[PDB]
């Protein structure tokens, strides 16, 4: 009797129903992770995303050691690897956390087929989401809800959640054993960035270290921060949880329970508003929206996406992605994103408006693909949905006025501390010209020691001209939608 | 420039390389400091857009009865026929 748990997005030992269930009359357990260069999305991914994952793997491997076991890491396509392991280890039990993503469902059906024709029982448990997503679609009449508001109404009339599974502790294992071997490492060891091909020369310690251990620690500190209260910081918070939820270092269901308990004590009721779980539900809403739409991350052939005649301009996209737009507020944000791998939600909104419906008129698909490469927390469906909504290409939530790539920064902080922090070449400029440096008198640039168009780029667009233009481009689009919905 | 990604190479290994959109762009120093989008004639691009819209017309989203219900209190412009509120303006609201 030999059992294998296959880790993908649930990189943790707490709240792992599928792992716990695999350890039932198991005799032999083996935890396995298979290296996928696509990160469950439509892109290949950069240095910060990979470092985050590897550290998730190390922590998982270290925590498994404490339980006198190991993580097994393998390169290859799942379809290739599993048939070998089946015969080689004499497998009869395989377990996974359910994946609602269309690509993941295809993959899992193919693997479940290989397993079945090898006498391998397959165990699937739902623990990446709060809810059974298919039950939510049923309550909506068979199709996923189009609007976050409808989604909220549905979840408010659902059954109370069952507690997180017992965490895998020495008792849980209960003499079930992982056979380690000679040459286990270097044959099944967690690789390093260097081993993967990256240049790690100019690389400071991660602002966002991976793994369950850091997640749990950050969760405690986050709840304490909230307990005390009942923007200067477009900057990475010590208590940020989003990358941890994305890789399952923190179980969404645990975070949910911890939130409800705190609410019950600080406040009278056992009826918190749904806003309390805004973070968890928004996430859950996009998984639900995408699960039956394999083209969720496309414009064409995506039946929830408005078809818009976006411009093509590789050079302008390139400037936007590298934060060389000539707009400090935007450049700063895209710079923090490159360096660190997280930016604030309102900052995501800012760079998305500028790229798409605001100034550049470039497809949201291009923006999405850059975020997939650089943003630690990017999830296929969440990231696509956002980019669609932000560009007025879909209807998940109300449309808002396009953010100004000058004024939004002025409202946020007029001292421009954020800007100076990520843009050194600009540090000298006074608050007067800090958002519009091209407006600096030709002598002020001499004093700042930064010439617009020499040391810092010229503004790639006449923003006001492009805004008025694009806003007309949009009017014509939504006009024609009404004419044909007629 | 710090923007490379890990591609899958031959069956053997992974290859570090710039992403396609970067490889496709001319990204030399001048462009990055000096490139500005041309100023274009408004009507010319609207008319050019409108040509495109006629081709994109049959793939616009269609709303079922239930979806029309959901959309009523979130995107009023659907059942009203006008332009969405947030987009019926002259340009960047802050600037004007
Ligand atoms: Cl899922
Ligand atoms: Zn503006």
Coordinates of C-alpha atoms and ligand atoms in Angstrom, one line a residue:
Chain A
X1 CA 0.0 0.0 0.0
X2 CA 1.7 3.2 -1.2
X3 CA 0.3 6.7 -1.2
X4 CA 1.3 9.9 -2.9
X5 CA 0.1 13.4 -2.1
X6 CA 0.6 15.8 -5.1
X7 CA 1.2 19.4 -4.1
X8 CA 0.4 22.2 -6.5
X9 CA -1.3 25.2 -4.9
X10 CA -1.8 24.0 -1.4
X11 CA 1.8 24.3 -0.1
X12 CA 1.1 23.8 3.6
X13 CA 0.6 21.2 6.3
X14 CA -2.3 22.9 8.1
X15 CA -5.8 22.6 6.7
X16 CA -4.9 19.9 4.1
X17 CA -7.9 17.6 3.9
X18 CA -6.5 15.7 0.9
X19 CA -3.1 15.0 2.6
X20 CA -4.8 13.9 5.8
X21 CA -7.2 11.6 3.9
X22 CA -4.3 10.0 1.9
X23 CA -2.9 9.1 5.4
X24 CA -5.6 6.6 6.2
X25 CA -4.4 3.1 6.1
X26 CA -1.6 4.3 3.9
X27 CA 1.5 2.3 5.0
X28 CA 3.6 4.7 2.8
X29 CA 3.2 8.4 2.1
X30 CA 5.2 10.5 -0.3
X31 CA 4.7 14.2 -1.0
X32 CA 5.6 15.3 -4.5
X33 CA 5.8 18.6 -6.3
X34 CA 6.3 18.8 -10.1
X35 CA 8.1 21.9 -11.6
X36 CA 5.8 23.8 -13.9
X37 CA 7.4 26.9 -15.6
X38 CA 3.9 28.3 -16.5
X39 CA 2.7 28.8 -12.8
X40 CA -0.8 27.6 -13.5
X41 CA -1.3 30.6 -15.9
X42 CA -0.7 31.8 -19.5
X43 CA 2.9 33.0 -19.0
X44 CA 6.4 32.2 -18.2
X45 CA 7.5 33.8 -15.1
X46 CA 10.4 35.9 -13.7
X47 CA 12.9 35.8 -10.8
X48 CA 10.8 37.0 -7.9
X49 CA 7.9 34.7 -8.7
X50 CA 10.3 31.7 -8.9
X51 CA 12.2 32.6 -5.7
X52 CA 8.9 32.8 -3.8
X53 CA 7.9 29.3 -5.0
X54 CA 11.3 27.8 -4.2
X55 CA 11.1 29.2 -0.7
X56 CA 7.6 27.7 -0.4
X57 CA 9.1 24.4 -1.3
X58 CA 12.0 24.7 1.2
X59 CA 9.7 25.5 4.1
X60 CA 7.4 22.6 3.1
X61 CA 10.5 20.4 2.8
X62 CA 11.8 21.6 6.2
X63 CA 8.4 21.2 7.9
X64 CA 8.1 17.7 6.5
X65 CA 11.5 16.8 8.0
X66 CA 10.2 17.6 11.5
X67 CA 7.6 14.9 10.7
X68 CA 10.5 12.6 9.7
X69 CA 9.7 12.8 6.0
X70 CA 10.7 14.7 2.9
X71 CA 9.4 16.7 -0.1
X72 CA 10.0 15.1 -3.5
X73 CA 10.5 17.6 -6.3
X74 CA 10.5 16.4 -9.9
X75 CA 11.0 18.2 -13.3
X76 CA 8.7 17.0 -16.2
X77 CA 5.2 16.9 -17.5
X78 CA 2.8 15.3 -15.0
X79 CA 1.6 12.9 -17.7
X80 CA 5.1 11.7 -18.1
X81 CA 6.2 11.4 -14.5
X82 CA 3.2 9.7 -12.8
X83 CA 3.2 6.5 -14.9
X84 CA 6.8 5.9 -13.9
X85 CA 6.2 6.6 -10.2
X86 CA 3.1 4.4 -10.2
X87 CA 5.1 1.3 -11.2
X88 CA 8.4 2.4 -9.5
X89 CA 6.9 3.0 -6.0
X90 CA 4.0 0.6 -6.2
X91 CA 1.4 3.4 -5.8
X92 CA -2.2 2.6 -4.9
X93 CA -3.3 6.0 -3.5
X94 CA -2.9 9.5 -5.0
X95 CA -4.3 12.7 -3.6
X96 CA -4.7 16.3 -4.7
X97 CA -6.4 19.6 -3.8
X98 CA -9.1 20.3 -6.4
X99 CA -8.3 22.9 -9.0
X100 CA -11.2 24.7 -10.5
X101 CA -9.2 26.3 -13.4
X102 CA -10.0 25.0 -16.8
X103 CA -6.4 24.0 -17.6
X104 CA -6.1 22.3 -14.3
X105 CA -9.3 20.3 -14.8
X106 CA -8.0 19.1 -18.2
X107 CA -4.7 18.1 -16.6
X108 CA -6.3 16.4 -13.7
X109 CA -8.7 14.4 -15.8
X110 CA -5.8 13.1 -17.9
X111 CA -3.8 12.1 -14.8
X112 CA -6.9 10.6 -13.1
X113 CA -7.2 8.5 -16.3
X114 CA -3.6 7.2 -16.1
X115 CA -4.1 6.4 -12.4
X116 CA -7.3 4.5 -13.0
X117 CA -5.7 2.3 -15.6
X118 CA -3.0 1.6 -13.0
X119 CA -5.2 0.6 -10.1
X120 CA -4.6 3.9 -8.3
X121 CA -7.4 5.3 -6.2
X122 CA -7.6 9.1 -6.6
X123 CA -8.5 11.4 -3.7
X124 CA -9.7 14.9 -4.4
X125 CA -10.6 17.5 -1.7
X126 CA -11.6 21.1 -1.9
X127 CA -9.5 23.4 0.1
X128 CA -8.2 26.1 -2.2
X129 CA -11.5 27.9 -1.9
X130 CA -14.0 28.5 0.9
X131 CA -16.9 27.0 -1.1
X132 CA -17.7 24.2 -3.5
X133 CA -17.6 26.5 -6.6
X134 CA -20.0 24.2 -8.5
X135 CA -22.6 24.5 -5.8
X136 CA -22.4 28.3 -6.1
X137 CA -23.1 28.0 -9.9
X138 CA -26.0 25.7 -9.2
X139 CA -27.5 28.2 -6.8
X140 CA -27.2 30.8 -9.6
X141 CA -29.2 28.7 -12.0
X142 CA -26.4 26.8 -13.8
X143 CA -24.2 29.7 -15.0
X144 CA -21.7 31.6 -12.9
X145 CA -22.7 35.1 -11.7
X146 CA -21.6 38.0 -13.8
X147 CA -21.5 40.5 -11.0
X148 CA -19.7 40.4 -7.6
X149 CA -22.9 41.7 -6.1
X150 CA -25.0 38.7 -7.2
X151 CA -22.1 36.5 -6.1
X152 CA -22.3 38.0 -2.6
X153 CA -26.0 37.4 -2.4
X154 CA -25.5 33.8 -3.2
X155 CA -22.8 33.1 -0.6
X156 CA -24.8 34.9 2.1
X157 CA -27.4 32.1 1.8
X158 CA -25.1 29.1 1.9
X159 CA -24.3 26.6 4.7
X160 CA -21.9 27.5 7.5
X161 CA -18.4 26.4 6.8
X162 CA -17.0 23.2 8.2
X163 CA -13.8 23.6 10.4
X164 CA -10.3 23.4 8.9
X165 CA -8.9 19.9 8.7
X166 CA -6.7 18.8 11.6
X167 CA -3.1 19.8 10.7
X168 CA -0.7 17.0 9.8
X169 CA 1.2 16.4 13.1
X170 CA 3.2 13.4 14.3
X171 CA 0.0 11.8 15.7
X172 CA -1.7 12.2 12.3
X173 CA 1.0 10.3 10.5
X174 CA 0.8 7.5 13.1
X175 CA 3.7 5.2 12.0
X176 CA 2.8 5.8 8.3
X177 CA 6.2 6.1 6.8
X178 CA 8.1 7.9 4.0
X179 CA 11.0 5.8 2.7
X180 CA 13.9 8.1 2.2
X181 CA 16.9 6.8 0.3
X182 CA 20.5 7.2 -0.8
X183 CA 20.7 10.2 -3.2
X184 CA 17.3 11.5 -2.3
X185 CA 18.6 15.0 -2.6
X186 CA 20.0 16.0 -6.0
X187 CA 17.5 13.5 -7.4
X188 CA 14.4 14.9 -5.6
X189 CA 15.8 18.0 -4.0
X190 CA 14.4 21.5 -4.1
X191 CA 16.5 23.4 -6.8
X192 CA 18.0 26.8 -6.4
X193 CA 17.7 29.9 -8.6
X194 CA 21.2 29.4 -9.9
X195 CA 20.4 25.8 -10.8
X196 CA 17.3 27.0 -12.7
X197 CA 19.3 29.5 -14.8
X198 CA 18.8 32.8 -13.1
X199 CA 21.5 35.4 -12.4
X200 CA 21.3 36.1 -8.6
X201 CA 24.2 38.6 -8.5
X202 CA 22.3 41.8 -7.7
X203 CA 19.7 40.3 -5.5
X204 CA 18.7 41.5 -2.1
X205 CA 16.8 39.4 0.4
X206 CA 13.2 38.9 -0.5
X207 CA 10.7 41.5 0.9
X208 CA 8.3 38.6 0.6
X209 CA 9.8 35.4 1.9
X210 CA 7.9 32.3 0.9
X211 CA 6.3 29.4 2.8
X212 CA 3.7 28.3 5.4
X213 CA 5.9 29.4 8.4
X214 CA 6.1 33.1 7.3
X215 CA 2.4 33.0 6.3
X216 CA 1.3 31.8 9.8
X217 CA 3.5 34.4 11.4
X218 CA 2.2 37.2 9.2
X219 CA -1.4 36.0 9.9
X220 CA -0.9 36.5 13.6
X221 CA 0.6 40.0 13.1
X222 CA -2.2 40.9 10.7
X223 CA -5.0 40.0 13.1
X224 CA -3.2 41.9 15.9
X225 CA -3.0 45.0 13.6
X226 CA -6.8 44.8 13.1
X227 CA -7.5 44.1 16.8
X228 CA -5.9 47.5 17.6
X229 CA -7.9 49.6 15.2
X230 CA -11.4 48.2 15.1
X231 CA -1.7 56.5 2.2
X232 CA 2.0 56.6 3.3
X233 CA 2.2 52.9 2.6
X234 CA 1.9 52.0 -1.1
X235 CA 4.8 50.0 0.4
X236 CA 5.0 46.3 1.2
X237 CA 3.4 45.6 4.6
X238 CA 5.0 43.2 7.0
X239 CA 1.4 41.8 7.4
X240 CA 0.5 41.3 3.7
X241 CA -1.1 38.0 3.1
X242 CA -1.9 37.8 -0.7
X243 CA 1.1 35.8 -2.1
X244 CA 0.5 33.3 0.8
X245 CA -3.1 32.7 -0.2
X246 CA -2.1 32.4 -3.8
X247 CA 0.3 29.5 -3.1
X248 CA -1.7 28.0 -0.3
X249 CA 0.9 28.8 2.4
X250 CA -2.1 30.2 4.2
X251 CA -5.4 28.4 4.0
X252 CA -8.2 30.7 3.0
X253 CA -10.6 28.7 5.3
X254 CA -8.3 29.2 8.3
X255 CA -8.0 33.0 7.6
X256 CA -11.8 33.1 7.3
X257 CA -12.2 31.4 10.8
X258 CA -9.6 33.6 12.4
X259 CA -11.4 36.6 11.0
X260 CA -14.9 35.6 12.2
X261 CA -13.7 34.8 15.7
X262 CA -12.1 38.2 16.0
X263 CA -15.2 39.9 14.7
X264 CA -17.3 38.1 17.3
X265 CA -15.2 39.3 20.2
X266 CA -14.6 42.9 19.1
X267 CA -18.3 43.2 18.1
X268 CA -21.7 42.1 19.4
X269 CA -23.0 39.9 16.7
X270 CA -22.4 36.6 14.9
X271 CA -23.6 38.4 11.8
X272 CA -20.6 40.2 10.3
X273 CA -21.2 42.0 7.0
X274 CA -19.7 40.3 3.9
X275 CA -17.2 43.1 3.6
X276 CA -15.2 41.4 6.4
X277 CA -14.3 38.7 3.9
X278 CA -13.9 41.1 0.9
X279 CA -10.5 39.8 0.3
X280 CA -11.5 36.1 0.4
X281 CA -14.8 36.5 -1.6
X282 CA -13.4 38.7 -4.5
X283 CA -10.8 35.9 -5.0
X284 CA -13.5 33.2 -4.8
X285 CA -15.7 35.1 -7.2
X286 CA -13.1 35.0 -10.0
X287 CA -12.5 31.3 -9.7
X288 CA -16.2 30.7 -10.0
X289 CA -16.5 33.0 -13.0
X290 CA -13.7 31.3 -14.9
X291 CA -14.1 27.6 -14.1
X292 CA -16.3 26.9 -17.1
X293 CA -14.7 29.4 -19.5
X294 CA -11.4 28.2 -21.0
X295 CA -11.1 31.6 -22.7
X296 CA -11.5 33.7 -19.6
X297 CA -8.0 35.2 -20.2
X298 CA -8.7 36.2 -23.8
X299 CA -10.6 39.0 -25.5
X300 CA -11.8 37.1 -28.6
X301 CA -14.2 34.2 -28.1
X302 CA -14.6 35.3 -24.5
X303 CA -18.4 35.6 -24.2
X304 CA -18.2 37.9 -21.1
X305 CA -15.7 40.3 -22.6
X306 CA -16.4 43.4 -24.6
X307 CA -14.6 43.4 -27.9
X308 CA -12.5 46.5 -28.2
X309 CA -10.2 47.6 -31.1
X310 CA -7.0 48.0 -29.0
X311 CA -3.9 49.6 -30.6
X312 CA -0.8 47.7 -31.2
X313 CA 2.5 49.3 -30.1
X314 CA 5.3 47.0 -28.8
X315 CA 7.6 49.9 -28.0
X316 CA 5.0 51.7 -25.9
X317 CA 4.1 48.5 -24.0
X318 CA 7.8 47.9 -23.4
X319 CA 8.2 51.4 -21.9
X320 CA 5.2 50.8 -19.6
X321 CA 6.4 47.4 -18.4
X322 CA 10.0 48.7 -17.6
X323 CA 8.6 51.8 -15.9
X324 CA 10.1 54.1 -18.5
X325 CA 6.9 56.0 -19.4
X326 CA 8.0 59.4 -18.3
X327 CA 5.3 59.5 -15.7
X328 CA 6.8 59.2 -12.2
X329 CA 3.7 57.9 -10.4
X330 CA 3.5 55.1 -13.0
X331 CA 7.2 54.4 -13.3
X332 CA 7.5 54.2 -9.5
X333 CA 4.8 51.6 -9.3
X334 CA 6.1 49.5 -12.2
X335 CA 9.5 49.8 -10.6
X336 CA 8.3 48.5 -7.2
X337 CA 6.6 45.7 -9.1
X338 CA 9.7 44.6 -10.9
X339 CA 11.9 44.9 -7.8
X340 CA 9.6 43.4 -5.1
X341 CA 6.7 41.5 -6.8
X342 CA 3.8 43.2 -5.0
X343 CA 2.1 46.6 -5.5
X344 CA -1.0 48.0 -3.8
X345 CA -4.4 47.4 -5.3
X346 CA -5.0 51.0 -6.1
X347 CA -1.6 51.1 -7.7
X348 CA -2.6 48.1 -9.9
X349 CA -5.6 50.2 -10.9
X350 CA -3.4 53.2 -11.8
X351 CA -1.0 51.3 -14.1
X352 CA -3.9 49.4 -15.7
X353 CA -5.8 52.6 -16.6
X354 CA -2.7 54.1 -18.1
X355 CA -1.9 51.1 -20.2
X356 CA -5.4 50.4 -21.4
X357 CA -8.4 52.8 -21.5
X358 CA -6.5 55.8 -20.2
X359 CA -3.6 56.7 -22.3
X360 CA -1.9 53.9 -24.3
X361 CA -5.0 52.1 -25.6
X362 CA -3.2 48.8 -25.4
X363 CA -5.1 45.5 -24.8
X364 CA -5.6 44.5 -21.2
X365 CA -4.2 41.1 -22.3
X366 CA -0.7 42.6 -22.6
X367 CA -1.0 44.1 -19.1
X368 CA -2.2 40.9 -17.6
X369 CA 0.7 39.1 -19.1
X370 CA 3.2 41.5 -17.5
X371 CA 1.5 41.0 -14.1
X372 CA 1.7 37.2 -14.5
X373 CA 5.4 37.6 -15.0
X374 CA 6.2 39.9 -12.1
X375 CA 3.3 39.8 -9.5
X376 CA 3.7 37.2 -6.8
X377 CA 0.0 36.8 -6.1
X378 CA -1.2 36.8 -9.6
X379 CA -3.8 34.0 -10.2
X380 CA -5.0 33.2 -13.7
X381 CA -8.6 34.0 -13.2
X382 CA -8.3 36.8 -10.7
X383 CA -5.7 38.6 -12.8
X384 CA -7.7 38.3 -16.0
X385 CA -10.9 39.4 -14.4
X386 CA -9.3 42.5 -12.8
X387 CA -7.7 43.5 -16.1
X388 CA -11.0 43.1 -17.8
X389 CA -12.9 45.1 -15.3
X390 CA -10.3 47.8 -15.0
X391 CA -10.4 48.4 -18.8
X392 CA -14.2 48.5 -18.9
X393 CA -14.1 45.2 -20.9
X394 CA -16.4 43.4 -18.4
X395 CA -19.0 43.8 -15.8
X396 CA -17.9 42.3 -12.6
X397 CA -18.3 45.6 -10.8
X398 CA -19.2 49.3 -11.4
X399 CA -17.0 51.3 -13.7
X400 CA -15.1 54.3 -12.1
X401 CA -13.5 57.4 -13.6
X402 CA -10.2 56.6 -15.2
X403 CA -7.4 57.4 -12.7
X404 CA -5.1 60.4 -13.6
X405 CA -1.4 59.4 -13.8
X406 CA -0.6 62.7 -12.0
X407 CA -3.4 63.6 -9.7
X408 CA -4.0 60.2 -8.1
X409 CA -0.4 60.4 -6.9
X410 CA -0.9 64.0 -5.6
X411 CA -3.9 62.9 -3.5
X412 CA -2.1 59.9 -2.2
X413 CA 1.0 61.8 -1.0
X414 CA 2.1 65.3 -2.2
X415 CA 5.6 65.0 -0.7
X416 CA 6.2 62.2 -3.3
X417 CA 8.1 59.9 -0.9
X418 CA 7.0 56.8 -2.8
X419 CA 8.3 58.3 -6.0
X420 CA 11.7 59.3 -4.6
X421 CA 12.0 55.9 -3.0
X422 CA 11.7 53.9 -6.2
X423 CA 13.0 56.5 -8.6
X424 CA 16.4 57.7 -7.5
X425 CA 17.2 60.0 -10.5
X426 CA 14.2 62.2 -9.5
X427 CA 14.9 62.5 -5.8
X428 CA 16.0 66.2 -6.1
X429 CA 12.8 67.6 -7.6
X430 CA 10.5 69.7 -5.4
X431 CA 6.9 68.7 -4.7
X432 CA 5.8 71.3 -7.3
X433 CA 7.1 69.3 -10.3
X434 CA 7.5 65.9 -8.7
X435 CA 4.5 64.4 -10.6
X436 CA 5.0 66.5 -13.7
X437 CA 8.8 66.8 -14.0
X438 CA 8.6 67.8 -17.7
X439 CA 7.1 71.0 -16.5
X440 CA 10.3 71.8 -14.7
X441 CA 11.9 75.1 -15.9
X442 CA 15.1 74.1 -17.8
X443 CA 17.1 75.3 -14.8
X444 CA 15.3 73.3 -12.2
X445 CA 16.4 70.2 -14.1
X446 CA 20.0 71.4 -13.8
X447 CA 19.6 71.7 -10.0
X448 CA 17.8 68.4 -9.7
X449 CA 20.7 66.9 -11.8
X450 CA 18.2 65.2 -14.1
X451 CA 17.3 66.3 -17.6
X452 CA 13.9 65.4 -18.8
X453 CA 14.6 63.3 -21.9
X454 CA 18.2 62.6 -20.9
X455 CA 18.3 61.1 -17.4
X456 CA 14.6 60.5 -17.1
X457 CA 12.4 59.8 -20.2
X458 CA 10.2 62.3 -21.9
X459 CA 6.5 61.7 -21.1
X460 CA 5.5 59.1 -23.8
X461 CA 2.0 60.7 -24.2
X462 CA 0.4 64.0 -24.0
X463 CA -1.9 62.6 -21.3
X464 CA -4.8 65.1 -21.6
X465 CA -4.9 64.7 -25.4
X466 CA -4.7 60.9 -25.2
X467 CA -7.4 60.8 -22.5
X468 CA -9.9 63.0 -24.4
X469 CA -9.2 60.8 -27.5
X470 CA -9.5 57.4 -25.7
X471 CA -12.6 58.5 -23.9
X472 CA -14.2 59.2 -27.2
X473 CA -13.0 55.9 -28.5
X474 CA -14.9 54.3 -25.6
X475 CA -18.1 56.3 -26.1
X476 CA -18.3 55.1 -29.7
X477 CA -17.8 51.5 -28.4
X478 CA -20.5 51.6 -25.7
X479 CA -22.8 53.5 -28.1
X480 CA -22.5 50.6 -30.6
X481 CA -23.2 48.1 -27.8
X482 CA -26.5 49.8 -27.1
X483 CA -27.4 50.0 -30.8
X484 CA -26.9 46.2 -31.1
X485 CA -28.4 45.2 -27.8
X486 CA -31.5 46.9 -29.3
Chain B
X1 CA 17.0 45.0 -17.6
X2 CA 15.8 42.5 -15.0
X3 CA 12.7 41.4 -16.9
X4 CA 13.6 38.0 -18.1
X5 CA 11.6 34.8 -17.5
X6 CA 12.3 31.1 -17.4
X7 CA 11.1 29.5 -20.7
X8 CA 10.9 25.8 -21.1
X9 CA 13.8 24.9 -23.4
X10 CA 14.4 21.6 -25.1
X11 CA 13.1 18.5 -23.2
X12 CA 16.4 18.7 -21.4
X13 CA 16.4 22.1 -19.6
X14 CA 15.0 25.5 -18.9
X15 CA 16.2 28.6 -20.8
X16 CA 16.5 32.1 -19.3
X17 CA 15.3 34.7 -21.9
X18 CA 13.4 37.9 -22.4
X19 CA 9.6 37.5 -22.8
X20 CA 8.3 37.7 -26.4
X21 CA 6.7 41.2 -26.0
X22 CA 10.1 42.5 -24.9
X23 CA 12.0 40.6 -27.6
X24 CA 9.6 42.1 -30.1
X25 CA 10.0 45.6 -29.0
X26 CA 12.8 48.0 -29.9
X27 CA 14.0 48.7 -26.4
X28 CA 17.3 50.5 -27.0
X29 CA 18.2 53.5 -24.8
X30 CA 16.8 56.3 -27.0
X31 CA 13.2 55.0 -27.3
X32 CA 13.2 54.4 -23.5
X33 CA 14.0 58.1 -22.9
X34 CA 12.9 59.8 -26.1
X35 CA 9.9 57.9 -27.6
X36 CA 6.5 59.6 -27.5
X37 CA 3.3 58.5 -29.2
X38 CA 2.5 60.5 -32.3
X39 CA -0.3 63.0 -32.1
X40 CA -3.2 61.6 -34.2
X41 CA -6.3 63.1 -35.8
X42 CA -9.3 62.3 -33.6
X43 CA -12.0 61.6 -36.3
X44 CA -9.6 59.6 -38.5
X45 CA -9.0 57.1 -35.6
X46 CA -12.8 57.0 -34.6
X47 CA -13.7 56.2 -38.2
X48 CA -10.9 53.6 -38.4
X49 CA -12.2 52.2 -35.1
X50 CA -15.7 52.2 -36.4
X51 CA -14.6 50.1 -39.4
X52 CA -13.3 47.6 -36.9
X53 CA -16.3 47.6 -34.6
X54 CA -18.5 46.5 -37.5
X55 CA -16.4 43.4 -37.7
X56 CA -16.4 42.9 -33.9
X57 CA -20.2 43.5 -33.8
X58 CA -21.4 39.8 -33.8
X59 CA -19.0 38.8 -31.1
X60 CA -20.1 41.4 -28.5
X61 CA -21.4 39.8 -25.3
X62 CA -25.0 38.8 -25.2
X63 CA -26.9 38.9 -21.9
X64 CA -29.4 36.3 -20.8
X65 CA -32.5 37.1 -18.8
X66 CA -30.8 36.2 -15.5
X67 CA -27.7 38.2 -16.4
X68 CA -29.8 41.2 -17.4
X69 CA -31.3 41.0 -13.9
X70 CA -27.9 40.9 -12.2
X71 CA -26.7 43.9 -14.3
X72 CA -29.7 46.1 -13.6
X73 CA -28.4 47.5 -10.3
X74 CA -24.7 47.4 -11.1
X75 CA -24.6 48.7 -14.7
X76 CA -27.8 50.8 -15.2
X77 CA -26.7 51.7 -18.7
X78 CA -27.6 48.2 -19.9
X79 CA -31.4 48.5 -19.5
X80 CA -31.3 52.3 -20.1
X81 CA -29.5 52.4 -23.4
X82 CA -27.3 55.3 -22.5
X83 CA -23.6 55.5 -21.8
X84 CA -22.2 54.2 -18.5
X85 CA -21.8 57.0 -15.9
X86 CA -18.1 56.8 -15.3
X87 CA -17.3 57.0 -19.1
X88 CA -19.6 59.8 -20.1
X89 CA -17.2 62.6 -19.5
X90 CA -14.9 64.9 -21.6
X91 CA -11.6 63.3 -20.5
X92 CA -9.5 62.9 -17.4
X93 CA -11.8 64.2 -14.6
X94 CA -8.9 65.4 -12.5
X95 CA -7.5 67.6 -15.2
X96 CA -10.8 69.1 -16.1
Ligands
LIG1 CL1 -10.0 26.2 -7.1
LIG2 ZN1 -5.2 63.6 -16.0

